[PDB]
Subunit: 388 residues, 4 copies
């Protein structure tokens, strides 16, 4: 009933514990599970849920053929109970479209879906499950947003959008929403040169987003937002522990204010928690494909251009498929600190497994522990041969 | 807890944004989706839902054979969560029958289903999910009603019924319900010559219904209802932009008080928003079949017999199947005006696609934006060949 | 929150309107619908539901083979939303067993299931969805009860049980429950000679049950219960309009205090509303099998041994299968009178349709109207050939 | 809203009445039922539910192949409505892992799941459906817990864990949780020599757990816990009525403080109610396999090393498969005493039925009656041949 404020710091991250896993592809082999991609997790004050972009067809359905494609009229933001699969029967549609974000402000939820042709897309902003505001494309080139949850502070929920080229300069804007209405927007500033798919979290009245530089950067750009002043800055993770994909091999020195070069015109959505010595980065294990997943403790990664790992945890083996990854937290949990969480999208099917005509995924997520817990690896678990 | 009153005017309609889409036929290829037709959308104070007439069988079911037929003992008004498909497992039965309307009065919902043989049908009026009033056929020839939501003002919810010929004069009545009980009824008056399937909306204490003249009219008849005085008038859309189907080509001058001739004994359910310069008409793109769908801004369409379009938006391409269309609004949304919405029924199967033995549909709906948003088209999306 | 009292009389029954229909066999041809039999309907203060005895298998399932049998360890009382089918996914288990009754007292629901071998059955009485009281077989021969709803007055809910022979004298008891606990029980008294499967309703502080005399009677026995005094009487419907099945042809004079002879050791569950001139009897149309269903207005049927029909309504054609029938009312509806309702079980499969190895049913129900409504017939609607 | 206290004694157990049965394997032959094992039952103040460890696949699914294995990344604690089957669509995930316990403290529920590799497992303790505490393996050898409900008193919920060898001494700890946080833990004390899979219940401020001595004991070890002092003792059931499996034949004298020998390195989860003369033991009927199930009244079983049965009830015939068994009660029921309940896991498939490639189960549960009720037997009911 009151707006949530980001009054807590991050809990100390000494390891990662299992939080949720839906095993959707394994289950959907013989049940009515929707084809998805671009998943995430997001909490309300009373419940945490899985989110994704449906493809408007089940995996066993004949319409799963062609679901490698990102943008169609048959996609929607859906949510469903934590660690359940996204089924026809339990999935709740938040809005229609092929790019999305969602977050709860303490009173109710804002959800945003973008749809349309590449040269004529529009965002619709829903609040309390009703449409409130619409925003037309400004650069006529795939208006797109975070693909993971936004974050609110005292009713203000900033959102990062990009419109324009994926392979060159583009037009990124930060919109400050309150009750679904635009209070303010700003063009991107600071030293980040290209922004896509920001993964955001909040602590002590500041919002930190780790994004994707698709054009040039194999280091990740970072936007930090003041939701009270409604202003921001941007830079890159200084660390030579490079966290995009594909990427070149790790150097000994990163770049703070420019893209680390070697790979152009590609990338993957990812995240980090940047908190002094309590800093952890996620990356694919493979430098070449969306394969494996690990967390690395890299003290002062944001500001130290020579920072290297001091601790890690494997999440997905390099012999298993990963995908997108992003940040969320339960802002309504008990205790004195916010417990960092993340999910990894485990992509199955095309293009890496082309004996099937579909592309989908399942989800695994973890939250931080102050213990030093033993590690397991967490693969999707399905046998593609079963679908043949 | 208090009855809703129609105290707001329409918001300015500068374009249409995507509101919901269930992709039911695509999904139902490989999941337990009910065969439907005659869908619509209707809001409660806390939730908006999809509605339709079930055929009492799934699409993949063997009993889907013969579902081209309109009236059987196996039909029911069902509702289900917005943008979900109507499945066996999530569909809520409102009442039994093969013609329906439904609306929430601010306190609770009235639903009306008609059933019976052609010469002996009866309406049952449910209120708060209990049967309250029954009305026997008066002309012994397919008692039938709106096939989209009714509208209430201070507890009074008028409903348009017709009984008698589809190809000649018939007996249309306006019933004024309150808490499921008949306060009053009137025979149709004014200059409309035949009435079927009224699509209604409310603003500033007046209810406007755009209907179907099946007998002679390719322009659409309009009934306007005063729910306080419980009186009405009727006429036609004066505009030469003709909105029934099938229809002749558009002339340069319409008819205000008579059917525009050229096509007899056929039609399709449709709608309009008639609000001075803020007037938008829906129509099929094709003059010959239920094919394509567009919105056209036609200032003063109701009263100006030479009014032509000043703006439009394609909703469904002429190379895709459409169907019935109708009006609803979220009367319980925030803000200072009512946002116009509509749905289009996207019919698949018979008679146009006769390699399958069924007829069903999916739903797409839009609401108005005060922005000038880019357009997409929104087809059903299923491949009939998959069902062979 | 207070116990319901039976303070109203019956509404005037001038005809019957459609109330609910699940089309379960049609739907279950291609969806996960449970095999059932012995269905009924029962209301809570906020909701009316369908009830039946599951067979613990779907209709398309291989375990549907053998479901002609009445009593197994795999049966349960289930309930589900009105006019939905009883599916694996929406069916709520009330208790385990192969004979049941259920009713809401205004505060919460009592449900009773009997299970066990023929010579060692026991009833368990649940109240507020917890087990409270148990009753062991007293005659060691299929302890059994109503197979339709019980009725409560000020917290007292009487229930009719029988234990002993189906083809000879047996031991019938009336148990008076309050909050799941036995206040009192009585052995059957009056002139009814054999009692099974009582269909009960309540009005003006009196409960009337129309039952099945399996041993000798083709007229139906009637128990009338005073739930305040906790006493009862019994007799037969005096009317020569005979309402059991199988039965001989109607005579011109019935029997008030003895079984009307001609058919031994068989019958079907049925019901009536006995209310002076406002008296309506249900029966199968066929005298030989569970085929067709009609309602007949038979003024003073209970007390007039020459009473004949003055009005009727066909519910199911004689060319369609029927089955069990029973009474319920919405005791929590608005208005000044209780509206009589009933359901008919539409049995499909064995023994009448033996090309399938299963037996199941769907449900149709009607409530009374004070109008003289036109009639339709309401068959199950499934094609058995589809299941071959 | 207040913590529950164990203020009542056990009701007198004169027999066992049927409480719930899901028939999951029968149903899942033709519906989307999850593969499970290690089930139990547990009540909240408003609802009792079935619980089990999913295998993250349906039974008909191709991924059911290999589900004989106990520990994978695809397992989760799920719960679902009482006597329903665990389906994809109705199952709620409590946490991720391959060993679990769960209990409600009167205010909210604690659930515990352990996951990880054998040498590096960890428990996560959820409370109010959020992760609160984590515990790393202490002996690096399959950290594991009860596989049935825990019990709380004034907010304190003790839990028994074991880590280390299954075939030798191991390290068992009793953790005392309150609101998901560790108040205290103790190493196992008393004369029990090996502890696994404790089945617990509470009465008069004391918690009694009957466990599994896998290493040496065919009598069952017992831990009794004081949740106020947070202290415990342990011993064995003195009775010569031996209740583990496999086991040697019953002797005439048991052992109170040592394992009864004859069978090493194997066992099954089981339970008892130890209450002076009101003492009942469950066991498999077979001494060799998980076959049959009976309850035996064995006065003073705990303390009398010559105690023999005075009464019994067969639950599952020796010609039917059983499995794990455990205790729960509805601590929130009305009345003056706690009614003892239990479930039996009915395992189907491997290793005993190896013509199928899966292993799963269904559930049956009973609660005590103060009547002397007739008995039935309660098999799983599925035909394995149907799955071939
Ligand atoms: C809105 C949209 O189409 N987003 C798509 C993006 C963009 O193509 C890139 O961010 C380049 O801008 O990336 C994906 O293709 C990918 O890499 O898996 C998936 C995603 O659906
Ligand atoms: C999941 C999986 O099998 N990953 C393998 C990948 C992929 O096969 C290709 O990168 C895709 O083209 O290749 C590796 O050489 C790599 O990139 O580190 C090794 C890894 O074992
Ligand atoms: C009650 C009823 O049968 N309504 C049917 C109507 C009427 O036939 C026409 O309005 C003529 O009166 O139109 C349809 O056939 C149609 O055109 O798709 C469908 C609809 O189910
Ligand atoms: C969805 C679709 O394919 N529509 C086509 C229709 C139909 O084929 C017929 O009208 C049905 O008989 O025909 C058109 O000539 C028309 O009417 O404008 C062109 C349009 O492309
Ligand atoms: C408890 C029980 O077995 N009830 C069964 C009864 C009894 O056999 C009769 O009432 C004779 O007592 O009738 C049926 O067989 C029937 O006629 O369709 C179905 C029902 O399940
Ligand atoms: C549903 C149905 O087909 N009913 C028919 C029944 C059954 O075939 C047999 O009674 C069953 O053995 O037979 C009749 O002669 C009858 O009894 O009145 C006519 C009726 O048309
Ligand atoms: C955590 C774990 O693996 N538990 C497994 C246990 C242990 O192996 C034994 O208790 C020996 O410690 O027993 C089972 O194998 C069994 O006997 O059916 C099933 C269960 O899943
Ligand atoms: C369910 C079942 O069939 N149980 C039978 C079992 C099993 O076949 C084997 O014990 C498994 O190997 O064997 C018995 O000799 C036994 O142990 O008492 C008899 C019993 O009838
Ligand atoms: C949950 C909560 O305390 N929210 C507070 C809100 O009450 C307050 O109005 C706002 C500005 O002070 O900061 C935030
Ligand atoms: C708490 C701890 O020791 N964690 C270490 C981790 O830092 C290391 O990356 C991994 C592989 O060696 O083994 C583990
Ligand atoms: C024997 C083994 O694998 N031990 C691993 C250790 O390497 C790792 O550091 C730790 C925390 O991640 O989990 C454990
Ligand atoms: C929601 C609301 O304000 N409804 C009002 C109602 O309270 C009032 O009684 C009626 C007549 O004045 O008009 C309407
Ligand atoms: C805001 C706007 O310009 N909308 C126009 C619309 O009026 C026109 O019908 C369509 C096709 O030309 O292109 C667009
Ligand atoms: C390049 C292109 O297609 N632009 C379209 C324009 O024609 C249309 O007017 C507008 C609003 O509908 O959407 C955009
Ligand atoms: C809903 C209702 O009015 N129930 C009344 C109850 O309050 C009263 O205690 C009882 C005896 O007088 O009769 C009944
Ligand atoms: C209101 C009315 O007239 N109902 C009659 C009914 O009594 C009769 O049984 C049936 C068949 O003739 O036709 C109708
Ligand atoms: C033409 C026709 O069938 N009319 C029937 C009439 O026979 C029946 O009496 C009435 C009420 O049931 O329904 C109507
Ligand atoms: C439901 C209930 O009565 N719980 C009581 C709680 O109120 C009390 O605080 C505690 C210690 O006295 O014992 C328990
Ligand atoms: C109440 C009663 O007599 N129960 C007995 C039970 O003790 C015995 O084990 C069983 C088999 O003889 O038969 C029964
Ligand atoms: C004839 C028969 O089987 N009677 C059984 C009896 O043996 C058993 O003692 C009792 C209670 O379990 O149930 C009954
Ligand atoms: O694979 C994770 C890291 O391992 C090592 C190097 O090959 C790095 O370039 C790489 O990113
Ligand atoms: O050097 C940083 C870390 O690298 C790795 C391990 O050898 C750790 O013990 C060490 O602290
Ligand atoms: O000790 C630090 C080491 O921890 C482990 C892995 O995460 C290594 O990548 C890392 O260097
Ligand atoms: O197709 C929409 C309109 O286009 C043009 C003319 O052919 C009209 O008669 C038609 O209605
Ligand atoms: O003429 C009315 C409208 O017709 C079309 C377009 O050319 C619009 O710019 C114009 O305003
Ligand atoms: O500018 C008006 C024009 O807009 C566009 C289309 O909707 C045309 O039908 C219309 O004439
Ligand atoms: O069929 C209903 C009635 O019709 C006539 C006679 O054959 C009766 O005996 C019969 O019961
Ligand atoms: O005779 C009783 C009734 O029987 C039949 C009809 O002919 C009715 O009109 C008549 O009233
Ligand atoms: O008019 C009374 C008549 O009504 C009609 C049928 O129900 C007949 O059975 C009945 O005799
Ligand atoms: O089968 C139950 C009991 O029956 C007898 C003996 O064979 C015992 O050893 C056994 O445990
Ligand atoms: O001996 C204990 C019990 O054993 C068995 C039966 O014979 C019971 O009657 C007896 O009481
Ligand atoms: O009378 C006691 C007897 O009851 C019966 C069975 O449970 C026997 O095992 C037991 O000895
Ligand atoms: Ca990049
Ligand atoms: Ca027309
Ligand atoms: Ca009889
Ligand atoms: Ca053992």
């Amino acid at each position: 009933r009151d707006f949530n404020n980001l009054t807590k710091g991050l809990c100390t991250i000494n390891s990662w514990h299992i939080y949720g896993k839906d095993n959707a592809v394994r289950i959907g082999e013989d049940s009515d599970v929707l084809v998805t991609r671009e998943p995430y997790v997001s909490c309300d004050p009373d419940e945490c849920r899985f989110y994704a972009l449906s493809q408007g067809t089940t995996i066993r359905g004949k319409h799963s053929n062609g679901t490698i494609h990102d943008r169609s009229q048959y996609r929607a933001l859906i949510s469903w109970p934590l660690s359940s699969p996204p089924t026809v029967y339990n999935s709740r549609v938040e809005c229609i479209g092929w790019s999305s974000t969602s977050c709860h402000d303490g009173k109710t939820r804002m959800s945003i879906c973008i749809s349309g042709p590449n040269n004529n897309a529009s965002a619709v902003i829903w609040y309390n499950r009703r449409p409130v505001t619409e925003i037309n494309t400004w650069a006529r080139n795939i208006l797109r947003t975070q693909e993971s949850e936004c974050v609110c502070h005292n009713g203000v929920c900033p959102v990062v959008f990009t419109d324009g080229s994926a392979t060159g300069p583009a037009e990124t804007r930060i919109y400050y929403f309150k009750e679904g209405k635009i209070l303010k927007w700003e063009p991107l500033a600071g030293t980040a040169k290209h922004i896509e798919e920001c993964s955001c979290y909040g602590e002590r009245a500041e919002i930190t987003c780790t994004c994707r530089d698709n054009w040039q950067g194999s280091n990740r750009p970072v936007i930090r937002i003041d939701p009270v002043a409604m202003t921001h800055t941007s830079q890159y993770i200084c660390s030579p522990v490079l966290t995009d994909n594909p990427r070149p091999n790790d150097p000994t020195v990163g770049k703070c204010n420019d893209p680390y070069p070697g790979n152009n015109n590609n990338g993957v959505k990812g995240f980090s928690y940047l908190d002094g010595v309590n800093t952890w980065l996620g990356r694919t294990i493979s430098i070449a494909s969306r394969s494996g997943y690990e967390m690395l403790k890299v003290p002062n990664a944001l500001t130290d251009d020579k920072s290297k790992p001091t601790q890690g945890q494997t999440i997905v083996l390099n012999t298993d498929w990963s995908g997108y990854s992003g940040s969320f937290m339960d802002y309504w949990a008990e205790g004195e600190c916010y417990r960092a969480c993340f999910y990894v999208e485990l992509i199955r099917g095309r293009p890496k497994e082309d004996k099937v005509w579909w592309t989908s995924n399942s989800i695994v997520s973890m939250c931080s522990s102050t213990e030093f817990l033993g590690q397991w690896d967490w693969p999707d678990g399905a046998k593609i041969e079963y679908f043949l």
